[PDB]
Amino acid sequence: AIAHLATEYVFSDFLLKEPTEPKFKGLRLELAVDKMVTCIAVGLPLLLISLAFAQEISIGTQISCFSPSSFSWRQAAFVDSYCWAAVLPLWLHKFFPYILLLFAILLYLPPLFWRFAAAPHICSDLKFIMEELDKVYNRAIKAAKSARDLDMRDGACSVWSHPQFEKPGVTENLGQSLWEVSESHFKYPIVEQYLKTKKNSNNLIIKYISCRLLTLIIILLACIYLGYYFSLSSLSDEFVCSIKSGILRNDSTVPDQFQCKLIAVGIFQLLSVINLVVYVLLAPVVVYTLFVPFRQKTDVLKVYEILPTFDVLHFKSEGYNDLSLYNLFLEENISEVKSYKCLKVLENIKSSGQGIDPMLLLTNLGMIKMDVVDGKTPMSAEMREEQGNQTAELQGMNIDSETKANNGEKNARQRLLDSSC
Amino acid sequence: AIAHLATEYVFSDFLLKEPTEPKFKGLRLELAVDKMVTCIAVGLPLLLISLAFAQEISIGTQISCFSPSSFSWRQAAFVDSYCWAAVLPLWLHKFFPYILLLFAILLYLPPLFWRFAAAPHICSDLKFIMEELDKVYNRAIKAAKSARDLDMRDGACSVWSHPQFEKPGVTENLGQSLWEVSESHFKYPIVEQYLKTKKNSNNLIIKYISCRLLTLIIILLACIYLGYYFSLSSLSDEFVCSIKSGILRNDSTVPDQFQCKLIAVGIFQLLSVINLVVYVLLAPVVVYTLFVPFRQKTDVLKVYEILPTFDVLHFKSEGYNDLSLYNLFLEENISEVKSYKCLKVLENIKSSGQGIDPMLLLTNLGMIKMDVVDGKTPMSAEMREEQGNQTAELQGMNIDSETKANNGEKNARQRLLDSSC
Amino acid sequence: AIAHLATEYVFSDFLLKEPTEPKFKGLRLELAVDKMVTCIAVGLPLLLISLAFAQEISIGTQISCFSPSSFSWRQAAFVDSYCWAAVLPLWLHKFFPYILLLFAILLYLPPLFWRFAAAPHICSDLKFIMEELDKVYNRAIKAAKSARDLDMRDGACSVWSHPQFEKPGVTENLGQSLWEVSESHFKYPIVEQYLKTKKNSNNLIIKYISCRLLTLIIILLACIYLGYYFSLSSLSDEFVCSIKSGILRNDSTVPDQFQCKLIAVGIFQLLSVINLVVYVLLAPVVVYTLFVPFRQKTDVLKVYEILPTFDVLHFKSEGYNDLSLYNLFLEENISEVKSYKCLKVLENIKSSGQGIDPMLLLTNLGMIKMDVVDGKTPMSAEMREEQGNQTAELQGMNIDSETKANNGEKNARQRLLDSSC
Amino acid sequence: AIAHLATEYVFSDFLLKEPTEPKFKGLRLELAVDKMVTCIAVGLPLLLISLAFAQEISIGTQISCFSPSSFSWRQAAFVDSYCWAAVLPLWLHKFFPYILLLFAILLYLPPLFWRFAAAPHICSDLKFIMEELDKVYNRAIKAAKSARDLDMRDGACSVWSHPQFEKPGVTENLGQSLWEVSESHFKYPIVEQYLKTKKNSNNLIIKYISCRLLTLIIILLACIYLGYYFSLSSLSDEFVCSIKSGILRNDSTVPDQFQCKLIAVGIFQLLSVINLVVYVLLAPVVVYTLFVPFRQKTDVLKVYEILPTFDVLHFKSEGYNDLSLYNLFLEENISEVKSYKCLKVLENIKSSGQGIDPMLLLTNLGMIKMDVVDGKTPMSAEMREEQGNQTAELQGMNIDSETKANNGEKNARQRLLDSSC
């Protein structure tokens, strides 16, 4: 049978889990709900019909007819073969396994079109925006670190701890008393305009909704077909058959009518119920997530809201604007970014000491001015909060490979079981 | 059966998704529409006939005949075998599965010829042009960066921020007060003549249209055959058979005529409809994209239109000129180029401040002349817009591997299901 | 059946597409036409007979005979078995599938002998000649670049742009006012004598024509056999059979003669036509390309015709001289050489300015003598045309691996489909 | 059947084509003729019998007997089974497929013994001798290059071109006026004694001839068996059978004698002819190459005959001396050595200028003494013939891997085709 072989052909497509050697390429390229819907909606029909093909062979088993005892073995076989072909439309039982394949094939194209067209475009855009996110994070603390030697009040910490300027940090260059201050006028980063660039020119969102709506209508078309077939299969499966057509029209030995019955509709009726109940439960899941302002209402960029110099999240939520789609992909792809975890702890220092009036930008100089005028001892405070927030993401920014979609193995289903007797 | 094994043999050819380790080798080598047309036009006939071969075995099932009860089991079997061979031309039903294979094989050669001949040639040409695209981008800003130390009006920014000249950028060499200006007379780049080089000598475009037109005519040849077969199968499938030829010509026990019927035309008739409706819908898609001035009317090189020094897009659109073909391949292969994303944000600064009169070439010196005469503070403005547009593409320009066309795995279809009873 | 398993065994041999990690190892080792001829001439017979073996089982299906009704089931089976063995020569129908295998096996040896013997020899020769081609290209411009500091007339460009001599190019050594001139007497390169070395000693060309002519004669031998078989199968397929030999010679119950018929010649006759029409169309393709002075009349080395110092293409075209064969391999293997693309643009500057009198050897000094006597500004013109033609091929000249002929995968055909009933 | 599964088991052994990552490991380890003989002599019997096993099943098909009509279905089946076992020796037809397997297995051991024992020993010996071949080549020119600064007559070329001594060659050390001359007394290289070391102690040649002669005698043993079987199968295949042995000896209902016939000898007779004609054609090929002084009479070391200082090929050709065997392996393994191609052009300069009196050792000083006394200009002649013959083989002399014998893939034959009906 052909039923359970596209099963493994699809099992190697939604199980990517790419072993991303580079710094960050764990790009899902589709939402989690999309994978769950596609696998269930397509795979489940293949599993059910695979059971059916295990017994719907030996066409003489599909239909049987009653014949007079005077007939021979071959004459009785002719009647069964004749009525199977020379057949309320009862031919729907004949093509029932064929139809369920057509639904599965038509339910697999919309995922394929997205993979061929909209997948490479969304891969580079997310990679570029997350590439430059850590650059802003690194420069912000480095500018604060470069401003360290300007606000010394404790001891003689203008310049000290000098066997090497950055002996734990870096073995190059040396430092001395500061004479420069950071005055910046270019406050807007690259990401600020990139958000506005994607705020118009709706060309990738249309490829998303169009693929989704094509899948939705196919589900309804399959749902009504199962209901129509279920009603038809619940009426009867027996009919009278006459083979007196041709030279046998004037035969006085062949009986006028024969009794025949299809004995495969019992299994088919059960299969239609399972598909029907699953589809009517899958439809609300698809419908509930059609709306753009669905779950994940909370903002994702609020971590960098006040970090370098500027403000973030000055925009609302809307519909057809090519936005709120990259935000969805960012949430499922923010798992591997070292800036996010580092910023995930700053907001939690809002307890006593850094409470109702937090700034969290130059907090290093907050507790180096009220101490003793005599005695520097700066080596502990001046580094324990400097390389603990920069060295983590300063490793491996050059690797770029492993973009193939799940080469994997043939470990999935293969060829059914029974081959004997 | 042989039906559903070229299915996996072709499934490993249009699913490349090469894991390109090098800087940029994600070369599709064919358009997205070509892959969709080839897979549907070739794969779908194989899927349909694979269902058919699951039951068209045991030749006694293919045809049946009515015989007198006085015949034995072997004598009745002789009649069925005789009329199956000794057969309106009714032999078209016998060779119907054979013909559909011939269409699939003939529909696979034009893709194969393009792969063997025109694939390696188009691989190097696109790689070379995109290799030199980033070189022009890097030198343009570097020349602007090298011209930084000439237009200082703020403070004493002629030379400053000197623990190291390019401590974030590069640890080599040092800088001082500028005395050289960039005077260029060789304005034409290499890409300018390469476009004109491909503007004539039409030798790769002919290999594209010739392969496409061969596929188109085969589709029409298959379309008319299905219509002719559908009309024939709708007339009748029964005939009279006589075996009295030879020593049996003067036999007084064998009846003169027998009634026979082919019982496989019912399934075959349904299969012809599915192929017919799909092909008549696939034909407009192929025809609509035959014209060279199809979709993607907008220019792709307009991003570099005024970037280094010159102007781009001084040419119109035409037909047989070996042009407008590399442009199509560039659009599907511009996904992985760091110059494109960097230039994709310059045009969006057209708001207030950089509006009706934009230049976007030396905008760094626009806002360093009206500030205070006293106080340099140049470290912020002089670097935050320099390594943010150059370091991105300065990583990994040496790797070159992974040009194999989808080694992949055997995860596709394999050997059907049923083997018992 | 054995028909459709050498199909995958050969599918892994002509689909190399080696993922050449090294600088250039994309060596085809055979012409494109050779692959197309071998795959079609060998594969197509296997595909056709694979259909035939799907039904030519159960030897009682191969032949059938008419027996008296008084015979039992076993007695009737004896007659069919007897006449199948105890058989115009009608045994050609028995061995028809066997013969077509013999043609396929004999049509596969000539490719195998070339692979074992002439493949490694041609691999190193093409690799060596293309290795030294870029060396001549690099030294030519470098000599021109080394001669830059001798012909200065503009400004004071004798020596300038000196924070580092080759800061974009190379971080080593320094330059000053030139005092040496390039006087060369050894004008002949290594490639000049290598062409003459291969101009005699015809030992690899004989291994090419001998393999080709063996394939050609086998095609004609198969072509006549199909025509002879087609005529034989069009006469009759019925004969009389007598089993009265031995102790049954004096048996009064066994009828003297029986009527038998072979019912597999109908499918075999169709298969012979398909092979015949394909072979008579493949023969002109092979014949048309037998001549050495076939397509690719234009020279390939005309790009380097005047580049370093000398002239190229001082030779005509001839036959048995071991030449004009490496030229064919060079054309299909000139795809990956950085010297070719670089030289492909020089000839197109033949427009106004560099028209009827082009030299294109030291054109850098053409436009540095008529400018202003005061003001050097040499940094733009002296480098923008120097590293743009040398750095491209100065990367990765050490890698050498991936010479295996298509390890690939088992993604091709495997084991047919039907296994039940 | 077991016939066509050692076919793929052997297809992965003679198709090595190792992807040798190291500098040179493309070691064939066996001659080309040995691979062709082994594959044809062993593979071809497996292909032929694989056709035979597609129909020699259902033992009732192997033999058939005529029985009285009064017998039942089971009684008639007993007669066929009895005479098949209770059987001119006619049992040779029963064991014919078994025997052809025994020939194939016995024809595969001699290749296996050579692989296990004599393969690793011959791998290191050829690797070592070719490792030291390039060392002699490199030192010869380097000594000539080191002697360059001693024979200057043109200009003031005693020392010149000194921004760096070997700026294109190597960035280390510097050169000046020469004061040392190359006086050598140790003229014998390591390879000179290694040739004499292998000139005696015949221990690897015996493992070669012994394996070859075992294969030769097996071919003759198979050849006579086919001729004996062909004569036997051409006499008759029918015999009388009596089952009256035991309690049936005094049975008055069982007929005394039965007529039986083997119907598989027709296919077997054809198979014997194909094996016979192939073997009698393969025997002269093996015999013609038994002689040690066969083809490849010309010397291979004549390229280095006068290169460094000494003379080569002072020895004749003989038989059992453990020599003339490494020479055969050298010819098939001289494909990948950079010294060979470099020396392949020196002998072709024998035209005018370097004709009847060639030396080709210090030809660099031939054309630097008759030029002008004033003006050095040495930079062109002193390097263009120095790094063009040394840098080629100065890359990658450390890699050592990929010695496995064709890991490959399962792309070969697998499991036959037909599984239904």
Q: Please, where are the H alpha helices in C234-325?
A: 265-288
Chain D residues close to C81, C-beta within 8 Å: 61, 64, 261, 263
Q: Tell me the residues of chain D between 213 and 252 that have a Cβ less than 8 Å away from chain C.
A: 237-238, 240
- Check if the beta carbon of residue A259 is closer than 8 Å to that of residue A21: no
What strand order describes the sheet that includes B63-66?
Answer: B63-66, B258-262, B238-241
Token reading at A136: 């802003």
The label of the residue with tokens 């070439």 reads B361
Q: Write the CA distances from D375 to C22, C181, D156, D368, D372, integer angstroms.
A: 44, 10, 7, 12, 7
Token reading at B318: 């035409």
Token reading at A416: 């059914």
Tell me A91's DSSP state. G
Q: Which residue of D has its CA nearest to B2?
A: D417
Chain A residues close to C420, C-beta within 8 Å: 57
Classify residue A313 as left (phi > 0), alpha (psi -120 to 50) or beta.
left
Classify residue B208 as left (phi > 0), alpha (psi -120 to 50) or beta.
alpha
Token reading at D293: 């002084």
User: Of the candidates D381, D413, D418, which has its C-beta nearest C184's C-beta?
Assistant: D381
State the helix-helix crossing angle for B109-146 and B190-197, rounded to 10 degrees. Answer: 160
Token reading at D324: 């003339």
**Three-state secondary structure string covering A293-339:** CCCCCCCCHHHHCCCCCCCCCCCCCCCCCCCCCHHHHHHHHCCCCHH
Contacts of D33 (CB under 8 A, 6+ apart): D285, D289
From CA D292, how far away is CA D328, in angstroms rounded?
A: 10
From CA D56, how far away is CA D54, in angstroms rounded?
A: 6
Chain B residues close to C61, C-beta within 8 Å: 59, 81
Q: Please, where are the H alpha helices in C250-325?
A: 265-288
Chain C residues close to D257, C-beta within 8 Å: 247
From CA C171, how far away is CA C162, in angstroms rounded?
A: 12
Token reading at C65: 């005979």
From CA B143, how far away is CA B147, in angstroms rounded?
A: 6
Q: What is the DSSP string of A165-207?
A: TBTTTBSS----S------------HHHHHHHHTTS--SSSHH
From CA B382, how far away is CA A203, in angstroms rounded?
A: 36
CA dihedral sign of residues D354, D357, D360, D362: negative
**Three-state secondary structure string covering chain D:** CCCCCHHHHHHCCCCCCCCCCCCCCCCCCCCHHHHHHHHHHHHHHHHHHHHHCCCCCCHHHCEEEECCCCCCHHHHHHHHHHHHHCCCCHHHCCCHHHHHHHHHHHCCHHHHHHHHHHHHHHHHHHHHHHHHHHHHHHHHHHHHHHCHHHCCCCCCCCCCCCCCCECCCECCCCCCCCCCCCCCCCCCCHHHHHHHHCCCCCCCCHHHHHHHHHHHHHHHHHHHHHHHHHHHHCCCCEEEECCCCCHHHHCCCCCCCEEEEECCHHHHHHHHHHHHHHHHHHHHHHHHCCCCCCCCCCCCHHHHCCCCCCCCCCCCCCCCCCCCCHHHHHHHHCCCCHHHHHHCCHHHHCCCCCCCCCCCCCHHHHHCCCCCCCCCCCCCCCCCCCCCCCHHHCCCCCCCCCCCCCCCCCCCCCCCCCCCC
Contacts of D352 (CB under 8 A, 6+ apart): none
CB distance from C69 to chain A under 8 Å?
no
- Check if the beta carbon of residue C320 is closer than 8 Å to that of residue C202: yes
Are B270 and A408 within 8 A, CB to CB? no
Resolution expressed in Å: 3.2
Can you list the pairs that D312-320 forms with residues at least 24 positions away whose Cβ atoms lie under 8 Å?
Answer: D315/D195, D317/D292, D317/D293, D319/D292, D320/D202, D320/D205
State the helix-helix crossing angle for D206-233 and D265-288, rounded to 10 degrees. Answer: 150
User: Of the candidates D167, D377, D416, which has its C-beta nearest C173's C-beta?
Assistant: D167
Q: Which residue of D has its CA nearest to C403?
A: D19
Best of C39, C73, C259 to mutate (most B CBs within 10 Å, chain B): C259
Q: Which residue of C has its CA nearest to D51?
A: C2
Rounded to 5 degrees, φ, ψ at D243 are -105, 5
Q: Tell me the residues of chain D between 11 and 50 that have a Cβ less than 8 Å away from chain C.
A: 11, 17-21, 23, 26, 32, 35-36, 47, 50
**Which residue, among A221, A196, A187, A153, has the nearest Cα to A375 in the 3D structure?**
A153
- After which residues does chain A break, using C–N > 2.5 Å? 87
Token reading at A219: 């589900």
From CA B202, how far away is CA B208, in angstroms rounded?
A: 11
From CA D333, how far away is CA D127, in angstroms rounded?
A: 10
**Which residue, among D258, D229, D254, has the nearest Cα to D241 in the 3D structure?**
D258
Q: Which residue of C has its CA nearest to D76?
A: C74
Q: Write the CA distances from D297 to B273, C205, D294, D345, integer angstroms.
A: 70, 20, 7, 21
**Which residue, among C329, C189, C400, C191, has the nearest Cα to D393 in the 3D structure?**
C400
Q: Write the CA distances from B51 to A89, A99, B4, B232, D147, integer angstroms.
A: 22, 11, 9, 22, 81
From CA D38, how far away is CA D10, in angstroms rounded?
A: 10
Are A246 and B259 within 8 A, CB to CB? yes
SS3 category, C76: helix
Neighbours of chain C (3+ CB pairs under 8 A): A, B, D
Are C417 and B193 within 8 A, CB to CB? no
CA distance D167 to chain B (A): 21
User: Of the candidates A53, A135, A173, which has its C-beta nearest B167's C-beta?
Assistant: A173
From CA A121, how far away is CA C114, in angstroms rounded?
A: 45
From CA B69, how far away is CA B253, in angstroms rounded?
A: 12
Rg (CA), chain A: 35
Are C421 and B172 within 8 A, CB to CB? no
- Check if the beta carbon of residue C60 is closer than 8 Å to that of residue B137: no
SS3 category, B224: helix
From CA B181, how far away is CA B349, in angstroms rounded?
A: 28
- Check if the beta carbon of residue D354 is closer than 8 Å to that of residue D360: yes
SS3 category, A66: strand
Chain C residues close to D392, C-beta within 8 Å: 131-132
SS3 category, B241: strand
From CA D363, how far away is CA D355, in angstroms rounded?
A: 13
Chain A residues close to C73, C-beta within 8 Å: none
The label of the residue with tokens 């001119």 reads D88
Contacts of D394 (CB under 8 A, 6+ apart): D138
SS3 category, A128: helix
Are D414 and C409 within 8 A, CB to CB? no
CA distance A180 to chain C (A): 27
Q: Which residue of C has its CA nearest to A2?
A: C417
Q: What is the DSSP string of A10-44?
A: HHTTS-------SSS-----S-HHHHHHHHHHHHH
The label of the residue with tokens 């030449």 reads C323
From CA C219, how far away is CA C210, in angstroms rounded?
A: 15
Best of C14, C98, C174, C183 to mutate (most D CBs within 10 Å, chain D): C183
CB distance from A57 to chain C under 8 Å?
yes
**Which residue, among C270, C277, A1, has the nearest Cα to B99 in the 3D structure?**
C270
SS3 category, C319: coil
Q: Print burial letters for A216-227: b (CB count within 10 Å at least 16), e (below 16).
A: eebbeebbebbe
CA distance C421 to chain A (A): 6
What strand order describes the sheet that includes A63-66?
Answer: A63-66, A258-262, A238-241
**Which residue, among A286, A249, A250, has the nearest Cα to A40 in the 3D structure?**
A286
Q: What is the DSSP string of B58-75?
A: SGGGTEEEE--TTS-HHH
Are B419 and D419 within 8 A, CB to CB? yes
Can you list the pairs that B367-370 forms with residues at least 24 positions away whose Cβ atoms lie under 8 Å?
Answer: B367/A185, B367/A186, B368/B151, B368/B152, B368/B153, B368/B154, B368/B157, B369/B151, B369/B153, B369/B154
Interface A–B counts its CB contacts (< 8 A) at 215
Token reading at A75: 């004459």
Tell me B289's DSSP state. T
Contacts of C224 (CB under 8 A, 6+ apart): none
**Which residue, among B28, B43, B121, has the nearest Cα to B322 in the 3D structure?**
B121
Could you tell me whether strands B258-262 and A258-262 are parallel, antiparallel, or unpaired per DSSP bridges?
unpaired
CB distance from B103 to chain C under 8 Å?
no
Are B377 and A182 within 8 A, CB to CB? yes
**Which residue, among A52, A88, A56, A91, has the nearest Cα to A232 in the 3D structure?**
A88
CA distance A187 to chain C (A): 32
Chain B residues close to C421, C-beta within 8 Å: 57-58, 421
User: Of the candidates C66, C77, C417, which has its C-beta nearest B3's C-beta?
Assistant: C417
Q: With 0-12 CB in 10 A as exposed, 13-18 as middle and 19+ as buried, what is C341?
A: buried
Report the Cα–Cα distance between both ends of chain A, in Å, rounded: 17
Token reading at B15: 């699913």
Neighbours of A359 (CB within 10 A): 9
Token reading at B248: 């049996």
**Which residue, among C204, C199, C190, C203, has the nearest Cα to C128 in the 3D structure?**
C190
Give residue B342's identity as a one-letter amino acid code. Answer: C
Q: Tell me the residues of chain D between 262 and 321 that have a Cβ less than 8 Å away from chain C.
A: 263-266, 270, 274
Are C47 and B132 within 8 A, CB to CB? no
Q: Print burial letters for A246-273: b (CB count within 10 Å at least 16), e (below 16).
A: beeeeeeebeeebebebebbeebbebbe
Report the Cα–Cα distance between both ends of chain B, in Å, rounded: 17
Neighbours of A388 (CB within 10 A): 10
Q: Tell me the residues of chain C between 402 and 421 that have a Cβ less than 8 Å away from chain A.
A: 419-421
From CA A270, how far away is CA A280, in angstroms rounded?
A: 16
From CA D407, how far away is CA D12, in angstroms rounded?
A: 8
Q: Which residue of C has its CA nearest to A53?
A: C420
- Check if the beta carbon of residue C410 is closer than 8 Å to that of residue D409: yes
Token reading at D82: 């009895």
From CA A342, how far away is CA C3, in angstroms rounded?
A: 64
Method used to determine the 3D structure: cryo-EM
From CA B118, how far away is CA D250, in angstroms rounded?
A: 85
User: Of the candidates A181, A403, A418, which has its C-beta nearest B19's C-beta?
Assistant: A403
Are D67 and C58 within 8 A, CB to CB? no
Can you list the pairs that C293-297 forms with residues at least 24 positions away whose Cβ atoms lie under 8 Å?
Answer: C293/C317, C293/C324, C296/C327, C296/C328, C296/C331
Q: Tell me the residues of chain C between 107 and 136 that have a Cβ less than 8 Å away from chain D.
A: 113, 116-117, 120-121, 123-125, 128, 131-132, 135
Contacts of D198 (CB under 8 A, 6+ apart): D125, D322, D323, D326
Contacts of C287 (CB under 8 A, 6+ apart): C216
Alpha carbon C286 to its chain centroid, in Å, reads: 14
Q: Tell me the residues of chain A between 127 and 186 that have a Cβ less than 8 Å away from chain B.
A: 128, 131-132, 135, 139, 143, 172-175, 180-186
- Check if the beta carbon of residue C360 is closer than 8 Å to that of residue C345: no
Q: Write the CA distances from A227 to B63, C96, D8, D381, integer angstroms.
A: 36, 54, 52, 91
- Check if the beta carbon of residue C364 is closer than 8 Å to that of residue C385: yes
User: Of the candidates A9, A91, A248, which has its C-beta nearest B412's C-beta?
Assistant: A9
What strand order describes the sheet that includes D63-66?
Answer: D63-66, D258-262, D238-241
Q: Write the CA distances from C18 to B27, B126, B365, B404, integer angstroms.
A: 16, 19, 52, 6
User: Of the candidates D377, D408, D416, which has its C-beta nearest C1's C-beta?
Assistant: D416
Neighbours of chain B (3+ CB pairs under 8 A): A, C, D
Q: Which residues pair with D170 in a beta bridge?
A: D166
CB distance from A72 to chain C under 8 Å?
no
The label of the residue with tokens 């411009």 reads C141
Contacts of C122 (CB under 8 A, 6+ apart): C27, C29, C204, C329
Chain D residues close to C128, C-beta within 8 Å: 338, 341
From CA B335, how far away is CA D11, in angstroms rounded?
A: 43
SS3 category, B320: coil
From CA D195, how far away is CA D188, in angstroms rounded?
A: 12
CA dihedral (D410, D415, D418, D421) in degrees, to 10, reads -130
The label of the residue with tokens 């057949």 reads A87
Geometric angle at alpha carbon D325, from D321 and D329, rounded to 5°: 160
Contacts of A290 (CB under 8 A, 6+ apart): A212, A216
From CA B336, how far away is CA B23, in angstroms rounded?
A: 8
From CA D137, how far away is CA B364, in angstroms rounded?
A: 59
Rounded to 5 degrees, φ, ψ at A314 are -100, 15
The label of the residue with tokens 């004999």 reads C106
Are C401 and D51 within 8 A, CB to CB? no
**Which residue, among C194, C239, C230, C189, has the nearest Cα to C96 in the 3D structure?**
C230
From CA B135, how far away is CA B130, in angstroms rounded?
A: 9
